[PDB]
């Protein structure tokens, strides 16, 4: 019942933790893959109007009327819930430290294609310099028109 056994148990739990980290990283890979697929960078879209993927967005699909604007931290829509059932019992220090240090850096994907959805905004008002604005505007407005049927959404201008 001396240190040897508790150290054995520590090592076991840390191994289990490594496995879980690998699994959640696989999930993050799936998520970033999808989000890169559906909102490519604002240069590849020059090549898209040709191939069979131009009007590939439909009103039944999870990505509909969503307009990319950049890259930042998307919070990893998956759950990551632990089943803690203690009334402030004291847990081993060198394991709880590892789990806590895990549940904060592997919970948010690193820079990923963001989404400026417009299906539930009804008004957008930018603020700042002239052409810096018209940039992001032209950017997502082209990204919008390119993916959705010209028979499904309309655009208007005054300048």
């Amino acid at each position: 019942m001396r240190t040897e056994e508790v150290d054995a148990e520590r090592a076991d739990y840390l191994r289990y933790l490594s496995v879980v980290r690998d699994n959640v990283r696989a999930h993050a890979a799936e998520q970033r893959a999808a989000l890169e697929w559906s909102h490519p960078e604002p240069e590849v879209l020059a090549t898209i109007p040709g191939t069979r993927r131009q009007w590939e967005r439909d009103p039944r699909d999870r990505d509909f009327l969503v307009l990319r604007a950049g890259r930042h931290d998307v919070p990893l829509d998956a759950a990551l819930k632990v089943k803690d059932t203690a009334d402030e019992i004291d847990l081993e220090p060198v394991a709880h430290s590892a789990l806590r240090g895990l549940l904060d850096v592997q919970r948010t994907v690193r820079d990923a294609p963001t989404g400026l959805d417009v299906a539930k905004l009804a008004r957008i008002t930018v603020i700042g310099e002239a052409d810096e604005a018209r940039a992001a505007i032209r950017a997502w407005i082209a990204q919008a028109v390119t993916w959705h049927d010209p028979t499904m959404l309309g655009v208007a201008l005054a300048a």
Binding site: D90, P93, V94, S97, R100, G101
Partner: protein, 311 residues
């Protein structure tokens, strides 16, 4: 005359400053100059000490200082094992040379000191590296409530550099380990027809090295380990010939021949260098044997040096 020392002093100071000056532009010539810069510095700080050892002491201190101050001020790599090994061997030889210079020494206690230092540094090689890499030390909390902060993302973005630096430091440390583990074991048996405990000691240290090489995994480390017996053999050979004996030299060649024979029969035969094809009990026995060797080393070393005889 003295001019032989003024020349060394001038060249070494010039190289010091020039290697300190091109760090910013080249970063590759800088490290070559840094490596060659510690051959003249030790000459100036040893021959500069007039005498015959009361002079190697300052040379060792100089190489240790130069290595240390150049390794820190460096990028990720190319401060390769060369610098750390010079540093460690200089520190060890300085520690031993101080005792040799300020006191009297049996010229056998020297071999004991060197083999001990080598065994010590080799056995505690990894931890020492992980120290020198400056890892993010653990944050073990009390059972109270000092709930600590999570590590910032900066130090976690800097980690792959520290990992490579750790690998390099550990290879270098093992290098200096074997280098001293032979630098004494040759000053031991070769002197003039010494005691058989020296024979068992040198063979025990060689077998301890060649048995440690089953631990590590970096290939360069394993090579350094396995090569200790070989380098020892050749050093004994030349110390014999220069020792003007010409009898056991052919015996050193016989030994070296057995070494290369086992090397060869292991080379073209991928069924003996395969740990899987062996048995579990034999693995266990090899482990117990490797433990027994270095266990027995220190007591028989004390016997041989003769401190059971003072009492």
């Amino acid at each position: 005359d003295l001019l032989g020392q003024f020349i060394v002093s001038g060249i070494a100071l010039a190289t010091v400053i020039a290697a300190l000056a091109v760090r910013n532009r080249s970063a590759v010539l800088a490290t070559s100059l840094a490596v060659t810069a510690l051959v003249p510095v030790a000459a100036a700080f040893a021959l500069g000490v007039p005498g015959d050892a009361p002079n190697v002491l300052l040379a060792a201190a100089g190489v240790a200082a130069w290595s240390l101050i150049s390794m820190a001020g460096s990028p990720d790599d190319r401060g390769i094992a060369v610098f750390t090994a010079t540093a460690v061997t200089g520190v060890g030889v300085l520690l031993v040379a101080g005792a040799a210079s300020l006191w009297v020494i049996s010229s056998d206690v020297i071999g004991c000191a060197l083999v001990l230092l080598g065994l010590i540094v080799t056995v505690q090689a990894a931890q020492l590296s992980a120290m020198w890499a400056r890892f993010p030390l653990p944050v073990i909390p009390a059972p109270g409530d000092p709930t600590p902060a999570a590590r910032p993302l900066s130090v976690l973005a800097d980690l792959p550099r520290r990992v490579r630096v750790s690998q390099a430091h550990q290879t270098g440390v093992i290098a200096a380990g074997v280098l001293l583990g032979v630098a004494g074991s040759v000053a031991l048996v070769s002197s003039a027809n010494a005691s058989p405990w020296a024979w068992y000691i040198v063979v025990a240290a060689a077998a301890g090295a060649a048995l440690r090489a089953r631990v590590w995994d970096s290939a360069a480390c394993k090579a350094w380990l396995l090569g200790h017996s070989y380098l020892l053999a050749v050093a004994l050979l030349v110390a014999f010939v220069i020792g003007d004996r010409y009898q056991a030299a052919l015996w050193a060649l016989a030994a070296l021949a057995v070494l290369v024979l086992v090397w060869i029969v292991a080379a073209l035969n991928p069924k003996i260098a395969s740990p899987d094809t062996y048995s579990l009990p034999m693995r266990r026995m090899v482990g117990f044997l490797a433990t027994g060797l270095d266990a027995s080393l220190i007591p028989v070393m004390a016997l041989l040096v003769g401190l059971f005889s003072l009492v």
